[PDB]
Amino acid sequence: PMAVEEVIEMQGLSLDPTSHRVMAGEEPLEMGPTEFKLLHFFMTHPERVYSREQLLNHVWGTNVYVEDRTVDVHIRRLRKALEPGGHDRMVQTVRGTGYRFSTRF
């Protein structure tokens, strides 16, 4: 995608950095700012697995302080927001290791 604020798309799921609009095809999806940031990170760092520690650093930063399970909490809310189109299946748990976003499922 040779464009910075360009719309990211994967398996029918699109995310607009400018308007913060996320869609399963043409149906709009609802999620908070943390989930959006998490989804944005996943769609741009696909297939690879990340520990909660890595996801905390990439998404929450450092000037805040959050526990690892908080990641699990927002992973849940994100999956929940992605259900309409079944895209929640793209947010996958890597047993006792972390999470990955995949087109394969």
From Swiss-Prot:
DNA-binding region ranges: 5-103
Residue ranges that the Swiss-Prot or TrEMBL entry lists as coiled coil: none
Post-translational modification, as annotated: Phosphorylated by PhoR or CreC.
Cellular location(s): Cytoplasm
Stated role: This protein is a positive regulator for the phosphate regulon. Transcription of this operon is positively regulated by PhoB and PhoR when phosphate is limited.
Protein name: Phosphate regulon transcriptional regulatory protein PhoB
Originating species: Escherichia coli (strain K12)
Full-protein positions shown: 125 to 229 of 229
